[PDB]
Amino acid sequence: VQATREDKFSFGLWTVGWQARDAFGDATRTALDPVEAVHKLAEIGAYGITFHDDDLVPFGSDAQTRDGIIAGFKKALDETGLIVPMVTTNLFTHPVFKDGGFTSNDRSVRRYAIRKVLRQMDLGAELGAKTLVLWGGREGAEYDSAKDVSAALDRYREALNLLAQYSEDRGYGLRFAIEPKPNEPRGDILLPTAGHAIAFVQELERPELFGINPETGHEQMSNLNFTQGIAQALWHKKLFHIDLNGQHGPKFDQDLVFGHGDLLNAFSLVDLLENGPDGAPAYDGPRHFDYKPSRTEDYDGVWESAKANIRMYLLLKERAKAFRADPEVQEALAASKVAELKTPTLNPGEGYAELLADRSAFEDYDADAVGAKGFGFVKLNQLAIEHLLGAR
Amino acid sequence: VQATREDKFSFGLWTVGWQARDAFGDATRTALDPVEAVHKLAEIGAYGITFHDDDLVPFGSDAQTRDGIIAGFKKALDETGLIVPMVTTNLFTHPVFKDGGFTSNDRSVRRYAIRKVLRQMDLGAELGAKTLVLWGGREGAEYDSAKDVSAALDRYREALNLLAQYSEDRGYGLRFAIEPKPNEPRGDILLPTAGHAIAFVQELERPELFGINPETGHEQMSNLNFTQGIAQALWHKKLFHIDLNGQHGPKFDQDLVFGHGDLLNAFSLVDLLENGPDGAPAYDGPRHFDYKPSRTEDYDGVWESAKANIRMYLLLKERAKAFRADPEVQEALAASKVAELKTPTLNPGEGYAELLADRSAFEDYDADAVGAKGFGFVKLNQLAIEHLLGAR
Amino acid sequence: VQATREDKFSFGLWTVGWQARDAFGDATRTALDPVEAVHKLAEIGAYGITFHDDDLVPFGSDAQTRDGIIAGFKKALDETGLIVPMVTTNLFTHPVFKDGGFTSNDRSVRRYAIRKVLRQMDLGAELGAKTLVLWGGREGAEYDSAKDVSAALDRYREALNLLAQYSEDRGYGLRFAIEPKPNEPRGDILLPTAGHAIAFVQELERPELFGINPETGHEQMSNLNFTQGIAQALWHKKLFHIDLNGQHGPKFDQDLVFGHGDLLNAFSLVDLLENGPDGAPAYDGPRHFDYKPSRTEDYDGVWESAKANIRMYLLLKERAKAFRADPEVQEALAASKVAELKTPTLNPGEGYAELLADRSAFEDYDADAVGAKGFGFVKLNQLAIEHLLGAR
Amino acid sequence: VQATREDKFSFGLWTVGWQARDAFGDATRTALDPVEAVHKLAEIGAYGITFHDDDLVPFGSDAQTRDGIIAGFKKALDETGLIVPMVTTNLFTHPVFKDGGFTSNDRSVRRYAIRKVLRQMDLGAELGAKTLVLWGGREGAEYDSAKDVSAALDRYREALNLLAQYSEDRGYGLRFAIEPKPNEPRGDILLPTAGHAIAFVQELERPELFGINPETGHEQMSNLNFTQGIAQALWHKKLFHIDLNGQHGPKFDQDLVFGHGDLLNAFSLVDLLENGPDGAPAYDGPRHFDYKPSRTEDYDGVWESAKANIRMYLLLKERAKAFRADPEVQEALAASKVAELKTPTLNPGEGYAELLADRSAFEDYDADAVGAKGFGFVKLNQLAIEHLLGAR
Ligand SMILES: OC[C@@H](O)[C@@H](O)[C@H](O)[C@@H](O)CO
Ligand SMILES: OC[C@@H](O)[C@@H](O)[C@H](O)[C@@H](O)CO
Ligand SMILES: OC[C@@H](O)[C@@H](O)[C@H](O)[C@@H](O)CO
Ligand SMILES: OC[C@@H](O)[C@@H](O)[C@H](O)[C@@H](O)CO
Ligand SMILES: [Mg+2]
Ligand SMILES: [Mg+2]
Ligand SMILES: [Mg+2]
Ligand SMILES: [Mg+2]
């Protein structure tokens, strides 16, 4: 299988660039030059790169340095044909953000966090980025009495509303994507799941400019079904971006290669994004890999792992396609009545009164007889895995 | 401390009435008579009782029978002074609901599911109930290819829009509270967390009529912070009802007495609900205990466990109040800047243009200096714990 | 592929016979006749059947009735050529066992539990069973003060020593396998993981007669690595039996078909068992499926699901074989140094004296240079999954 | 209350010295001077201090330096009266240990790891330490095909056997305590639970010299009942040491103050360790706090947090004693038959022959009447909690 720009695979500079300094040890790899990252990624088949302001320009660089770095980065994209579909801001690393950016209890930190972001929005706009991703990693708490969640939500909203105002006024045309995470690094992070993030966005001033950027491992950290969660994000039309990676349930954030965690869910996810209505994908944005090359690898291991992500996604797509094209699958789908859920429960123009008058919907209904027919779901599931396994 | 009608403790008929038949064993208790339950609940301090249709009137009772039970039931209510704040429908027990009620792949079960609920709405209306709780326990799947999540949400919405229509035409004045649960009985249930339920509700035709009924244990089954999710629900103004109980993290649904599982989170929850805005509670609805007397107990144990629920709440309330009234806590709160979060990040009339002009919010900001001061959150947490243990 | 008797696939009478009454609903299937179950299993390729005393002979059957059932059973066995490799006793269903069998706080229940088991050993011995599995599903607690664990382990050991005694005296030649489970039905079950069971077994009077019967989902309920725990059980030589099924991390006991939960862990499990040292399997007992046909299925889904367990094992087996015979996989193994772990760390005859004397082990050790070499683990993982996917 | 040296509260140098560099951000605190630490801890009530080789002497310190540091360290101990009850070695930080120390695939690393430990054993012996704690934080894997678990256990055994040998020959008199942890930093760590660790120890050459050092948060990361695990560890006589802290279930290793995570389980643990048989504590070793002052804190929060660990243990101790001394508790314990578990199931001199001859244990036993009586566990639990809240 081969990756095309139409596949839209993107990588964050902080992914292949992760030096592997974890909570219990020192870095095992040297620093990756952004320019080299651009050439390597272009080479393995990626169509775009993303970055945190501090990933490209070292926190605290003068404008001379800053400017110089942007210029070279810009050349590299130029020469390679890579685009920057999204940019983000680092509101978690520096000690000042120890209690959050936008929701720090310290008012001065909150004003500073907004400024840091406006600036990144400027660069984003100049590089042609269309989405600003906001990961509130430090927004939350370790102790219940330390954070007033209501006030917190008011301040998160306040900051976001200003950001959309600016973008709209400067005409940047950006879309905002809130990234939910349940915990790590805070004991508990605000807006813990795709559901909480979606509900919150619905309360902003210009909600149409906001969506979510859910990450595979983030929902799996709470043992939730990532595919089902994405399906709901799609139903709401808030899937603005997506971070793909692997995780093995509730434990620290693993950030494994996509499909190296819950493989069955990785399969159902590709199927959902790709086998959309009418052949066409159900999702159109970047297929972004927010993962980390294991601490035990060297740069060889690093590039290997970058390609494994693309590879996993294309192998899965291929099997998802074959699955759906299989007449035996088509027959099992029919037997399990999966498409019957698409037919409205009520007849055309039928209301409460017509339903109340329908004796077959209750008075004359044989629940015991209907309760005994099987749905044939194990069989359909078995067909799916055989396709995944390449046994069909 | 003793319970008042003002405390608003309510219990489901099915809590104290649970025969303790579990997934691996026979019932260890005999059936509890409803008139009896009303009488015993009235005696321990409950102000109201709730029930699923099938808890009161056995599935399939002829009208004479059904009519007879209701009459007896109403008389018990009458005599004890107990009310029916909420009613619900059993859409999970009968085999016909094995793939869901509103979102079953089978269209006829969907139609019957609506009829069974309309009928319950009429009785609830008749008893004076103000809330209809909907727990979609059979909505979800075991395998991803078995359920079209999108179609399932359309059908969940189609059914609720109809229920609101009927309630409104008829003048019943009901409020609808959706109850989220991540799993059990289904592998994965649709609308798994408080967030997912709130996001969904915002998409119905008359959203103002819809809220959620979150359960302590359900959020804990995903290892989420229950108090923090209630804080967000209150922020959205969607906390229409609450189900209190205890649980020990992610494992089957335990349904312990409130406060017998995560005690620290039980404490922060009572503080949130009672030490509200003015001085006044932040939540005014029923404090409903959705628990189960452990299988190892007889009826003395059942009545002991019912009183334990009320005792845990009043004991926690008492300490929450004491916590907030302590000068040392006030001092700790001031050092942690909890209240500073309530002050807008921006000065009145300040926008991005003024923020951008403030050199001190960025260009001259000493982030290193700010990042070095502590928040003193451990100390605040320790004071809270000492109040809970009655150590101060 | 097709299963052979050499495959040693067995099923418990209670798996295909599960009537699907869960914690929230009635049964969706009628009862399966044991003779019929014998015939059907034989037909799908099983080599044996197992059962709890109460699965075959209804609790409280008079001796004439019990004798009759046993006789018809034996005939079916005879006629089909199926064997009974293991038997077990139900010490969890009847209300009497609500606080456990061997470890109930009530002395009389402990005496009756032992008699119930002795009677099953007789029947097992007569059907030719070689293993007696002990699943103490009710041994545990919901509250810490309710159970003295130390006393409980003493009582557990007391019962198990008597059982070995009787067996050895009767010349039954049985081996005992304790089956660990973390929770469900008790809040916390004693001997929660394979580890705890092994450590306990080591304290019996005749440890050589005791091992464990670990179950895939049971270890996954604690989010532990099943294959890795199995590897350790094999190092201790205590894998007497195994229960294969599927689970999705920490939540109620799902009992899915083997391979329908954690697919990647199912794959590495089959690699461990069959591609043992010296060509041959590392384990030679029954491959027992302790699963449940989903509640959504009828008898067709039931047989479908029994066959899916066998297909799943055979497909993974084929892929594990191909994986290991791949010269590229071999080269990756060499590069990752997997086999180098099998070489003693100390040289032959080397002791601490010589090690202390070797300056290349410390004094002249270049930690920094070794620390920089990659192990190539990601690439190895990628070939593994490419084999499972049938992409190689 | 006040801490005495008989309480035996000890702390690791890395606890109060944690600079708060997490997986996502920089250190928020400057480095702690070891002499100061000795002084500070002496002041809050600690009776001893512990450390990893590398906590005290910077990795790669010349002999001169090393010697220099130790000498100052011994002075501080001298001056203050603190002892070093236990010592440990860092086999997780330096990049060379990325695949483990003792079970690294790389043989040269295994040799180096051994050397590094020998050296710390010497320093330990010289400082008067009685226990060597071994935490194999890097022992495990991220991918199943990368680690032969059996060979890894062989190599782990091989290294421990040698250490015992050396200690015995040098006459050091050390006991060794293996510390289990399920994950972090490796995806899966070898010897994931107290269970697994005990089973392993039993396979060593001089098992009487080995035990375990379970940590509260480690067992809670897999959602196990810490108290029950320590009860088993005491049953086996393998509780050589204990690490006390707090955790909020399955998520990253939090390291909160003891009792700041699962408060009810911290209560039952204190009760188990102190309200041992013959009035006396069931455990007589160090009560060691392996925790971390939250990243949001400064040095004041650091000493605050140190004192909190002591305050929590002593407040809990005080309630555990009141609980056991309460007559109504005594009445509840009797009704729950907690002590009847201590009376052997069989009468003195009874074996299977006499048990078989007892019609009352089976043939004439009324399981139904026994099964109808409740154990009063809920009431007993409620009394325990009211004692903890200081409500009784
Ligand atoms: O768990 C960390 C998180 O995934 C981070 O990598 C974000 O995705 C980023 O800050 C915005 O893309
Ligand atoms: O998981 C059980 C669930 O909590 C159920 O008891 C609902 O709460 C009820 O059907 C609506 O109140
Ligand atoms: O969770 C239930 C457990 O798995 C049970 O099915 C045992 O396996 C059996 O009683 C002994 O084989
Ligand atoms: O998870 C970290 C681990 O607990 C470490 O702090 C050890 O306990 C130490 O290596 C020996 O005490
Ligand atoms: Mg991400
Ligand atoms: Mg509920
Ligand atoms: Mg089993
Ligand atoms: Mg520790």
Give me the half-sphere count of Cα atoms (radius 13 Å) on the Cβ side of residue D74.
12
Name the minimum distance, in Å, from the CA of B373 to any CA of chain C: 36
CA pair distance C194, C181, nearest whole angstrom: 8
Within 8 A by CB and 6+ apart from C325, the residues are none
Q: Do A253 and D253 touch (CB under 8 A)?
A: no
C-alpha span between A276 and A269 (Å, rounded): 11
For B121, half-sphere exposure in the C-beta direction (CA atoms, 13 angstrom radius) is 25
Nearest CA to ligand 2 atom 7: B135
DSSP type of residue D132: E
Cβ–Cβ below 8 Å for D25 and A138: yes
Question: E strand or H helix at D133, and its extent?
Answer: strand D131-135
Q: Which of D20, D247, D268 is nearest to C145 (CA)?
A: D268
CA nearest neighbour of C235 among D161, D203, D102, D134: D203
Give residue C210's identity as a one-letter amino acid code: F
Phi, psi of B184 (to 5 degrees): 75, 110
| Chain D: touching chains (3 or more CB pairs < 8 Å) | A, B, C
- Number of neighbouring beta carbons within 10 Å of residue B78: 10
Per the CB < 8 A criterion, the answer to whether C180 and C191 are in contact is: yes
Distance D130 CA to ligand 4 centre (A): 17
Whole-number Å distance between alpha carbons of C39 and C77: 8
Strand (E) or helix (H) holding A10: strand A9-12
Residue A141, token pair as written in the block: 């708490």
Helices A263-274 and A377-388: crossing angle in degrees, nearest 10, is 90
Ligand 1 closest atom vs CA A86: 12
Phi, psi dihedral angles at D355 (to 5 degrees): -65, -40
Contact assignment for D223 to B251 by CB distance below 8 Å:
yes
Measured distance CA(D75)–CA(D77) in Å, rounded: 5
Distance from CA of C24 to the nearest CA of B (A): 6
Burial of C108 (0-12, 13-18, 19+ CB in 10 A): middle
| Residue B11 · residue B46 · CB < 8 Å | yes
Contact D155 C115 (CB under 8 A): no
Task: Determine how many CB atoms are found less than 10 A away from the CB of residue D166.
Answer: 21
Query: What is d(CA C5, CA C16) in angstroms, rounded to the nearest whole number?
Result: 19
Angstrom distances, CA of residue C201 to CA of B330, C157, C191, D112: 55, 9, 10, 35
Q: D376: closest CA among A155, C145, A101?
A: C145
Query: Residue B123 belongs to what H/E stretch?
Result: helix B107-127
Q: Do D296 and A185 lie within an 8 Å CB cutoff?
A: no
Residue A154 CA to residue A160 CA, distance in Å, equals 10
CB contact under 8 A, C378 and A293: yes
Cα of B289 to ligand 6 centre, how many Å?
8
**Dihedral (Cα; C60, C61, C63, C67), 10-degree rounding:** -140
Question: Is some CB atom of chain C closer than 8 A to the CB atom of A263?
Answer: yes
* Cα–Cα distance for residue pair C277/C285, rounded to 1 Å: 16
User: For residue C140, what are the β-bridge partners?
Assistant: C189
Q: Report d(CA B48, CA B81) in Å as an integer.
A: 9
Residues with CB under 5 A from ligand 7 (ion): C 215, 243, 290
Among the bound ligands, name the one nearest to the CA of residue D11: 4
Asked whether the beta carbons of A349 and B100 are under 8 A apart, the reply is no
Note if the bond before D185 is cis, omega within 30 degrees: yes
Q: Which residues of D78-102 are buried (b: 16+ CB within 10 A; e: fewer)?
A: eebebbbbbbbbbbbbbbbbbbbbb
**CB of D387 sitting under 6 A from ligand 4:** no
Number of Cβ pairs < 8 A linking chain B and chain C: 101
Q: Which of D257, D371, D391 sits opposite B378 (nearest CB)?
A: D257
Total residues found in chain D within this entry: 392
Please, what is the end-to-end C-alpha distance for chain D in angstroms?
Answer: 19
Chain-centre distance of CA B235, in angstroms? 15
* C290 C-alpha to ligand 7 centroid (Å): 5
Structure tokens given for A339:
């498409």
Closest listed residue to residue D88, CA positions, set D148, D12, D169, D16: D12
Ligand 5 (ion): residues with CB under 5 Å are: A 215, 243, 290
Partner D contacted by B235 (CB < 8 A): no
Nearest-angstrom CA–CA distance, D252 and A286: 29
Q: Pick from D149, D34, D12, D145: which is nearest to D80 by CA? A: D34
Measured CA to CA, the distance from residue A311 to residue A303 in angstroms comes to 12
Q: For residues C365 and A296, what is the distance between their CA atoms, to the nearest angstrom?
A: 19
Give the per-residue SS3 of chain C.
Answer: CCCCCCCCEEEEHHHHCCCCCECCECCCCCCCCHHHHHHHHHHHCCCEEECEHHHHCCCCCCHHHHHHHHHHHHHHHHHHCCECCEEECCCCCCHHHCCCCCCCCCHHHHHHHHHHHHHHHHHHHHHCCCEEEECCCCCEECCHHHCCHHHHHHHHHHHHHHHHHHHHHHCCCCEEEECCCCCCCCCEECCCCHHHHHHHHCCCCCHHHEEECCEHHHHHCCCCCHHHHHHHHHHHCCECCCEECECCCCCCCCCECCCCCCHHHHHHHHHHHHCCCCCCCCCCCCEEECCCCCCCCCHHHHHHHHHHHHHHHHHHHHHHHHHHCCHHHHHHHHHHCCHHHHCCCCCCCCCHHHHHHCHHHCCCCCHHHHHCCCCCHHHHHHHHHHHHCCCC
Residue A85 DSSP SS3: coil
Rounded Cα distance, B306 and C389, in Å? 54
Token pair of D188 as six digits: 């899966």
Strands ordered across the beta sheet of D86-88: D86-88, D131-135, D175-179, D210-212
Q: Which of A94, A114, A340 sits opposite B345 (nearest CB)?
A: A114
Elucidation technique:
X-ray
Q: Which residues of C touch A263 (CB under 8 A)?
A: 263-264, 385, 388
Does residue B185 have a cis peptide bond before it, meaning omega lies within 30 degrees of 0?
yes
Hey, what domains does chain C have and what are their CATH numbers? 1-392 (3.20.20.150)
C243 C-beta closer than 6 A to ligand 3: yes
C52 torsion bin: left (phi>0), alpha (psi -120 to 50), beta (else):
beta
**Axis crossing angle, helix B263-274 with helix B226-236, rounded to the nearest 10:** 20
Task: Find out whether C179 is annotated in a ligand binding site.
Answer: yes
Rounded to 10 deg, the angle between the C63-80 and C107-127 helix axes is: 40
DSSP β-ladder status, B188-189 and B140-141? antiparallel
- The H or E element containing residue D377 is helix D377-388
CA distance D308 to chain B (A): 7
Query: Is B71 within 8 Å of B35 (Cβ atoms)?
Result: no
C193 CB near ligand 3 (under 6 Å)? no
Nearest to D154 by CA among C40, A57, C343: C343
In whole angstroms, give the CA distance from residue B193 to residue B222. 8
CA atoms within 13 A on the CB side of A211: 21
Q: Are D275 and D230 in contact (CB under 8 A)?
A: no
Q: Are D115 and C361 within 8 A, CB to CB?
A: yes
Paired with D133 in beta bridges are D88, D177
Ligand nearest to the CA of D13: 4
Phi, psi (degrees; rounded to nearest 5) at C157: -65, -40
- Determine which residue's CA is closest to atom 11 belonging to ligand 3: C135
Q: How far is C-alpha C291 from the chain's CA centre?
A: 11
Q: Decide: A32 in ligand 1 pocket, CB within 6 A.
A: no
Dist CA B192 CA B197 (whole Å):
7
* DSSP letter (8 states) at residue D143: S
Q: Is B10 exposed, middle or buried (CB count within 10 Å of its CB: 0-12, 13-18, 19+)?
A: buried
Is the CB of residue A1 less than 8 Å away from at least one CB of chain B? no
Residue in this structure with the two tokens 């950016």, named with its chain if needed: A101
- Is-contact D48 D85, C-beta < 8 A? yes
DSSP count for chain D of H helices, then E strands: 15, 10
Kindly report the backbone phi and psi dihedral angles of residue D177, in degrees, each rounded to the nearest multiple of 5, phi listed first: -125, 115
D262–C contact, CB cutoff 8 A = no
C203 to chain D: nearest residue by CA? D236
Q: Does the beta carbon of D304 lie inside 6 Å of ligand 4?
A: no
Can you list the alpha helix ranges (DSSP code H) found in chain A? 13-16, 34-44, 53-56, 63-80, 107-126, 149-170, 194-201, 216-220, 226-236, 263-274, 299-325, 327-335, 352-357, 367-371, 377-388
What's the CA gap between D76 and D53, in Å, rounded? 17
Backbone angles phi, psi at A18, to 5 degrees: -60, 115
* Radius of gyration for the alpha carbons in chain D, expressed in angstroms and rounded: 23
C238-257 burial, b for 16+ CB within 10 Å, e for fewer? bbbbbbbbbbbbbbbbbbbb
- Give dist(CA A260, CA A293) in Å, integer: 12
Look at ligand 2, atom 9, and give the residue with the nearest C-alpha.
B135
**CA-based nearest residue to A60, from A121, A119, A138, A20:** A119
On chain D, the residues whose CB falls within 8 A of the CB of A93 are 24-26
Sequence-separated (6 or more) residues with CB below 8 Å from residue B221:
B181, B182, B183, B184, B247, B249, B250, B251, B253, C251
Contact (CB, 8 A) for A74 and A127: yes
In this structure, which residue's CA is closest to atom 6 in ligand 4?
Answer: D290
Biggest CA–CA distance in chain C, Å, is: 81
Name the residue among C324, C332, C214 with its Cα closest to residue C277. C324
Q: Is B166 left (phi over 0), alpha (psi -120 to 50) or beta?
A: alpha
Task: Write out residues with Cβ below 6 Å of ligand 2.
Answer: B 52, 88, 133, 135, 179, 181, 215, 243, 253, 290
D118: contact with C, CB 8 A cutoff: yes
**What residue of B is the nearest CA neighbor of C29?**
B95
Rounded CA separation B211/B204 (Å): 11
Strands (E), B168-268: 175-179, 188-189, 210-212, 242-244
- Based on its alpha-carbon atoms, the radius of gyration of chain B, rounded to whole angstroms, reads 23
What 3-state DSSP class applies to A336?
coil
